[PDB]
Amino acid sequence: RSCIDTIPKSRCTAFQCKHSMKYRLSFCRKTCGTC
C-alpha cells in the first residue's frame, strides 16, 4: 500500500490514530505514523 493519507490530514487526530484501525491504517496512515 502507498504511504499516504487518503483524507485531508487536517481531518486526522491522535485520538482516531489510537482508537480506529481504519484511520490508523487507511484514512490517516501516513500522519498516524504507520508508514
Binding status of residue 29 toward Li ion by CB under 5 A:
no
Work out what residue 30 binds among Li ion, a second copy, none; the CB cut-off runs from 5 to 8 Å by kind.
Answer: none
Give the binding site for a second copy (CB under 8 A).
Answer: 1, 3, 9-10, 12-14, 17, 20-22, 24-26, 31-35
**Cβ atoms 12, 5 nearer than 8 A:** yes
Which of 28, 9, 8, 10 lies closest to 18, judged by CA? Answer: 28
Work out what residue 2 binds among a second copy, Li ion, none; the CB cut-off runs from 5 to 8 Å by kind.
Answer: none
Binding status of residue 16 toward Li ion by CB under 5 A:
yes
Quote the CA–CA distance of 2 and 20 in Å, as a whole number.
Answer: 19
